[PDB]
Amino acid sequence: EPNPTTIAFQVDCYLWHLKKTLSMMGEVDAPFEDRLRREQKALKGRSMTLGIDIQSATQEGYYKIKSITE
Amino acid sequence: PNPTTIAFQVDCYLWHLKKTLSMMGEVDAPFEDRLRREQKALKGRSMTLGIDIQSATQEGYYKIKSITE
DSSP, rough: OHHHHHHHHHHHHHHHHHHHHHHHHSSOOOHHHHHHHHHHHHHHHHHHHOOOHHHHHHHHHHHHHHHTTT | OOOHHHHHHHHHHHHHHHHHHHHTOOOOHHHHHHHHHHHHHHHHHHHHTTTOHHHHHHHHHHHHHTOOO
């Protein structure tokens, strides 16, 4: 019985860190990095609702993505 | 290269990840709402780019693993 709403937040947080990383690396286009600015305001708003640290959650998301793949 | 294509590859493979989690029943309904809405977006971009989703997925996989940790 793990918690879907928390996993979702963690995964969204990590995926954002992954997507952002590629933008850091100049490998993506402007709309991609625009969805990135907005997704960021989104997670903050969600971070504040759930009361869950984003740095903390990125870690867990990273873990979850790794388990279903690699 | 090029940035629009990479971005499409990443989006598609990331979508495949999100759906996998959706199927595992490990994410909630809004995440699944985002997933279903995104799907119709990606089909738009695919017929705009001339890039089939399956193949952009395959590509997306290798691209992300190379930055994974």
